[PDB]
Every structure is written in structure tokens, then in C-alpha cells.
Ligand binder design. Structure first.
Ligand code: HEM
Length: 311
């Protein structure tokens, strides 16, 4: 495993965020493939250039390919072990939808100008062969809190744990240092949420609001977000890297969280998601999912194979 050959899957969610889902036109496979191959080279060149121009601005990029896109572009080729089509989850109280999509970009920087420029330069190659599925603009709230006012990402794995849980190792050697990324846009019912007491919100989440100290298990609701969202199969505490992001039009009162979770194992994310939706996570009473798809995030070297037309 070498995290230096990974895309930016494992660390910084960033002060200014852009999320873009595209579909391929499915009009001319050859020409569409040719433009994805150009894009695999150009996207790295664009990051190099902006990192030269703005080295203090923490530019981070992750770009992804869905199962459907992979089957259409690379029909003759190997496929990452756990790459599948997400079609939604049938839950108890609540369902989650699946969204058809082919390409994903998660762009983060200290300034919105750099997130604008990455996408504007990439779309010179990709606009003639795509349509937009979703485009969301996100930001870091005060003290890295989610827009609901609780600290976002405290139980994320960090340093060696982030590598361990974030990127593909020797189990799938063709695609080592890749990642599986699940994108899921939620709208919040901020009015209802704001009418709860602090203590009522703390029951929903499983932690104290101001200090962010985890509640003692004796005091938690068993449907609290930080209980049901876990994957503890086989007495192992499975992790992914969550870099969740507020988005808002606060004039219109349209506010939400765009979930983005990077894992070595799609199987772990999918299990956490199944647990939430079958056991009725309390946070789902204030959170309505409106899209969702999973993408494979290639390593640097997999991008180089794609650019050189090996798949
Ligand atoms: C509206 C969407 C979401 C919001 C606002 C949200 C918010 C939070 C908050 C505030 C925490 C506690 C701080 C922390 O340890 O990070 C947390 C923890 C967590 N969330 Fe979420 N979350 C959302 C969606 C999801 C989704 C879709 C998943 C899984 C697919 C997930 C999995 C987790 C996990 C595993 C933890 C850590 C629990 C622990 O080990 O204590 N969350 N989330």
C-alpha cells in the first residue's frame, strides 16, 4: 500500500467544496471513452498547475467512476472487486433512492476560485460527452460542525488508521491504492431540528453538543446516530472516512448535508447504510436523502492505465 499513489480520499474535507455528478451521453461509446481517457491525464495536470499557482490553498481532488460507467467504457477489462450499482435501500420507516450517474468529482480548497477553476478546466474535455446529474456547492461551518451544530468527523480514523480503512490494499492488487466513494445528498428539516432542546438533539446524535464528548452508553438512545451507523460485525469496529459537508440557500431556507464516505470496503459503507435505514436512525427524522450513488476512485496509476487506453 502507498497512500502517495491515492487520490485525495483520506483527510481534508475543506473550507469550500464542490460536488459534481455527470452521466455519459451513451450516443457514441468511442468518442465518449476517448474524452474520459483525455480527462484522466488532464485532471492531474490541472491539479499540478493550480498547486504551483496556489501552494498554500490546500487543493484536494477525488474523481470517480460508477459501476455502470465502468461496464460501458471498459467492457473487456478487469473491474474492482466491490464495484457495484447502487439502486437505493429499502428501509423500515424510511427508504433511500438510487441515482444513475457515471462520473463523480469532489473538489475542495481554501478559496472558491480554485474549486471553480478545476471544474471549469475539466469540463472543456467532458462537456461535449456528458450531462449534469447533480451539482452541489458546500462549505465548512463553524468549528467544522455539521450544519445541525455538532462536530463532524470526530470518530473518523486518522493517520495510519485512515490508510488502513480508506484505500484498497493487497486484496485487489490491480486496483491497490484505489477507494470506493459513496455520495448521498440530504435535505434537513431545520425548523423541526431548531425547535428541539439541546438535550433532545444530543439524544438524536449520541454526543454532547458544545464539548462534543460522547455520551456514556448508559445515557444513549439505542437509535442514536452514533450507535446505529456503526459496523461492528465479527466484533471488529469497521471504519470509513466521512467528510460530510453543509450546503445551503439560507434566503430560501433550503439547507442540508452532502454525505461523502471513502472506504477500502464498499461492503462496510453499505452495511452502515443498511443499519441506519432498517433500525430507524433518529437523525433520519430530520434528514431526507434525495440522491445517492457509489463510485470507484482510481489510484494515480490506474488513471495512467486509463489515459494510455489499457482498459
Ligand atoms: C444527514 C447526514 C449525516 C449527518 C448530518 C451526520 C452527522 C454525524 C455526526 C454529527 C456524527 C458524530 C461525530 C463523529 O464521530 O463523526 C456522525 C458520526 C457517524 N456517522 Fe454520520 N451523519 C450523516 C450521515 C451518515 C451516513 C450516510 C453514514 C454511513 C453511510 C454515517 C456514518 C457515521 C458513522 C459511522 C459515525 C461514527 C459513529 C461512531 O463511531 O461513534 N453518517 N455523523
Amino acid at each position: 500500500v502507498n497512500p502517495q499513489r491515492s487520490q485525495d480520499v483520506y483527510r481534508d474535507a475543506g473550507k469550500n467544496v464542490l460536488f459534481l455528478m455527470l452521466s455519459l451521453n451513451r450516443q457514441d461509446q468511442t468518442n465518449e471513452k476517448a474524452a474520459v481517457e483525455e480527462t484522466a491525464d488532464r485532471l492531474q495536470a490541472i491539479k499540478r498547475s493550480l498547486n504551483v499557482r496556489y501552494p498554500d490553498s490546500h487543493l484536494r481532488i477525488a474523481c470517480g467512476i460508477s459501476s455502470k460507467a465502468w461496464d460501458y467504457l471498459f467492457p473487456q477489462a478487469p473491474k474492482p472487486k466491490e464495484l457495484e450499482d447502487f439502486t437505493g435501500i429499502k428501509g423500515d420507516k424510511y427508504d433511500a433512492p438510487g441515482t444513475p450517474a457515471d462520473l463523480f468529482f469532489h473538489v475542495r480548497a481554501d478559496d472558491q476560485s480554485l474549486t471553480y477553476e478545476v471544474i471549469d478546466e475539466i469540463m472543456t474535455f467532458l462537456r461535449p460527452v456528458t450531462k449534469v446529474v447533480d451539482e452541489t456547492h458546500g462549505f465548512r461551518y463553524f468549528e467544522g460542525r455539521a450544519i445541525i451544530g455538532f462536530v463532524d468527523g470526530t470518530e473518523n480514523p486518522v493517520d495510519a488508521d485512515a490508510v488502513e480503512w480508506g484505500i484498497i490494499h493487497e486484496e485487489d492488487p490491480e486496483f491497490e491504492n484505489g477507494s470506493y466513494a459513496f455520495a448521498q445528498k440530504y435535505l434537513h428539516q431545520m425548523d423541526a431540528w431548531k425547535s428541539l432542546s439541546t438535550e433532545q438533539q444530543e439524544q438524536v446524535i449520541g454526543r454532547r453538543k458544545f464539548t462534543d464528548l460522547e455520551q456514556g452508553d448508559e445515557d444513549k438512545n439505542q437509535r442514536a446516530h452514533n450507535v446505529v451507523s456503526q459496523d461492528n460485525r465479527n466484533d471488529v469496529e469497521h471504519k470509513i472516512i466521512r467528510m460530510n459537508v453543509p450546503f445551503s440557500d439560507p434566503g430560501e431556507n433550503v439547507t442540508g448535508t452532502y454525505f461523502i464516505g471513502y472506504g477500502r470496503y464498499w461492503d462496510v459503507t453499505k452495511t452502515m447504510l443498511t443499519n441506519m435505514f432498517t433500525k430507524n436512525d433518529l437523525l433520519l427524522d430530520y434528514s431526507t436523502p434525495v440522491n445517492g450513488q457509489v463510485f470507484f476512485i482510481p489510484s494515480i496509476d490506474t488513471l495512467d492505465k486509463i489515459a494510455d487506453d489499457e482498459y
